[PDB]
């Protein structure tokens, strides 16, 4: 069974994690 | 090197690292709002509440702020110390905060913007690790006390020594001290790269812009004896103008006639350079209040160089350029302007580049010299070249009325001229 979503948006929350935001980090350069 | 040599370089590289908690307690207690004693006290959890009340007003002023709120102003964003990610990380860092000075150095004025670089100097250490492009963005406001409490923290780099005199000053860093940081020729190869990359973004802004120039204008100034300074000067400040030609926006292009009007007065450039820079102000010129300025340029280009070849005629690609950007019936009422500058020896390679390439408007060559008083030679120069035209053209009666004029006025260098070259009788008689 897969995790969906809203579950995993509990899991970057609460386990601290940051890869979420590490990747909108890498993911822009001169967006403007 | 000595001991203490290399164990204090230790110390540069972990400026940041907390260690004891007094090491904690003179790092954190250093911003740019709260005093030294109230900012120790504080969480970043106190700290982020502040900053992202205040950066979505920000982006309401403009929607640009708002994807920062998504990396850097996140709540996930918190958690995360600069020293326990890897260098590529680091780098991505630096160009988030990097394209962050860029946006917030233009509402510098405003309150929200020192609510918000206050989170992202106090999380993130930007008064520490960055301090170039944190310096840089917001260098014209020196006279304002924003830019002192901004001195009030940075440990300066080596390349700004010369504020280092002002760091926790009482009176703010005078005009001539700015002046004195761009007379160095290192500090301009930052400031080159730092428009360059401010224009490649498009927010350049017009306060910035004029205090760009003004220090620019005056590192020319100071310079103008030492003909070396000058010689290695230009590779820094031409290839600026050159890029601040290119930019869309009209209030760039304005400040390139700054810098190359002032510096071709100061040193006489080439003439292969200054048909260069004709070109380039020629080609990305389409507001109105650019082309008032642009015109002033070639006008006050064409005098500064003076040599062989001073009043030779315009090459194809250059002239019919110039009629394309200015007209004739505008360049004309330009001469008829009250203010009336020198427009002496640029129109005089005008009026023979007409003579050779288009020879239509001819009327008009003749009421360019009703305008403007010429000089002795340059109307002998013009004559020489109409009596080749003269030979030449399939004959036309409008070509005898311009004779007519110089009938009128210097008759004796009308002679000269045909008793340099050709009969006295035969030009009367052709016509």
Redesign the interface.
Same mark, same amino acid.
């Given at each position: 069974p897969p995790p969906d979503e809203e579950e995993q948006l509990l899991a970057?929350?609460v386990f601290?994690?940051?890869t979420?935001?590490?990747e909108?980090?890498?993911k822009?350069?001169?967006?403007? | 090197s000595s001991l203490s040599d290399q164990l204090a370089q230790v110390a540069s590289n972990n400026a940041t690292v907390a260690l004891d908690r007094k090491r904690r307690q003179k790092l954190h207690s250093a911003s740019l709002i709260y005093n030294s004693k109230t900012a120790a006290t504080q969480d970043y959890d106190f700290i982020f509440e502040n900053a992202s009340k205040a950066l979505e007003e920000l982006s309401q002023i403009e929607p640009?702020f708002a994807?920062f709120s998504?990396?850097l102003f996140?709540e996930?964003?918190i958690? /995360?110390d600069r020293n326990v990610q890897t260098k590529e990380?680091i780098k991505? /860092?630096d160009?988030?905060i990097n394209?962050y000075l860029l946006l917030a150095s233009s509402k510098w004025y405003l309150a929200p913007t020192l609510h918000a670089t206050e989170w992202l100097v106090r999380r993130f250490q930007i008064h520490v690790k960055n301090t170039e492009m944190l310096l840089l963005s917001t260098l014209n406001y020196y006279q304002t006390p924003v830019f002192k409490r901004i001195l009030s923290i940075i440990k300066l780099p080596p390349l700004f020594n010369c504020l280092s005199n002002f760091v926790r000053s009482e009176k703010p860093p005078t005009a001539l001290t700015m002046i004195k940081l761009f007379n160095d020729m290192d500090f301009l190869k930052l400031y080159t790269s730092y428009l360059d990359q401010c224009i490649?973004?498009?927010?350049t802004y017009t306060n910035q812009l004029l205090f760009t120039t003004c220090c620019f204008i005056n590192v020319v100034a100071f310079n103008s004896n030492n003909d070396e300074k000058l010689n290695q000067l230009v590779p820094i400040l031409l290839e600026i103008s050159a890029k601040l030609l290119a930019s869309k926006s009209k209030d760039c292009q304005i400040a390139a006639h700054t810098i190359l009007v002032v510096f071709a007065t100061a040193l006489p450039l080439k003439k292969t350079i200054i048909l260069a820079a004709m070109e380039t102000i020629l080609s990305n010129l389409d507001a109105k209040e650019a082309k008032h300025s642009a015109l002033l340029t070639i006008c006050k280009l064409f005098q500064t160089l003076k040599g062989q070849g001073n009043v030779d005629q315009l090459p194809s690609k250059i002239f019919k350029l110039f009629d394309s950007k200015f007209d004739t019936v505008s360049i004309l009422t330009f001469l008829d302007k009250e203010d009336k500058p020198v427009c002496d020896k640029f129109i005089t390679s005008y009026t023979r580049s007409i003579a050779r390439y288009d020879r239509s408007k001819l009327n008009i060559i003749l009421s360019l010299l009703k305008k403007i008083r010429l000089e002795r030679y340059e109307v002998r120069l013009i004559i020489t070249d109409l009596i080749y035209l003269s030979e030449i053209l399939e004959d036309k009666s409008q070509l005898v009325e311009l004779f007519e004029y110089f009938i009128s006025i210097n008759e004796d260098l009308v002679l000269k001229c045909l008793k340099s070259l050709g009969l006295t009788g035969x030009x009367x008689x052709x016509x």
């Open positions: 970057k929350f601290g994690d940051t979420d935001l590490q909108n980090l890498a822009f350069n001169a967006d403007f | 640009k994807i998504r990396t996140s996930s964003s958690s /995360l990380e991505d /860092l160009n988030a394209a490649k973004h498009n927010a």
